[PDB]
Amino acid sequence: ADTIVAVELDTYPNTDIGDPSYPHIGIDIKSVRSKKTAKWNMQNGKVGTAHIIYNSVDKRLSAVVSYPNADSATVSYDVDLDNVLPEWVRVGLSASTGLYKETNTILSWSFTSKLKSNSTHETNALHFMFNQFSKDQKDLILQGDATTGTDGNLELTRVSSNGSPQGSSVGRALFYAPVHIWESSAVVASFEATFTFLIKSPDSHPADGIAFFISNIDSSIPSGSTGRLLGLFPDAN
């Protein structure tokens, strides 16, 4: 199957498969069962920010999620992406709902990747920044219920005419061009991703979350990967 590496912003606690007893941030490596997690004070209704960093020197994947003027949550895990992911991958955002729902709105997204081989200043770089999403975003691959153009935002999961979120929905958005994430002869390789989101929920508890992920190029939404699976995993192993 696909090869996933993701940083999830889990809004619902499915303790029946690993989730801590509260909304959390986590690092997933080929499994929905996070290798490491951190408590997160989700704030239904307002805009938050997520910063994700990784470099080949420390080989440590770290994430920060915060809300303006509130406290921020941090999670880190040591991992050598070199022997987890293929040298060429695709990056994207995923989200889903199920029994409970929430909106999974992306207001902006930027990505930067740099690879310098042992030849020195021989640096290869890729950078894209989205602050506005048009109705026809040809540089994005939309899967599932994902749509763009509404208010200039990217809505990952189904949203009604008035803006009410819907249950049992999944959708992703991957950047069109393949990304060279690591090279055999690379002195330094690093990348950083950032995106602002807006999770609003009408019912009791919002669910199920958003996640930044890296995968094999031809990756696609697994069947039934709605709900607790965040549109990333076929099962919960």
Partner: peptide, 15 residues
């Protein structure tokens, strides 16, 4: 008043 649900933690501010 509007809200942050079943929220979690400590000292924070973005109403």
């Amino acid at each position: 008043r509007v809200w942050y649900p079943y929220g979690s933690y400590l000292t924070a501010s973005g109403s």
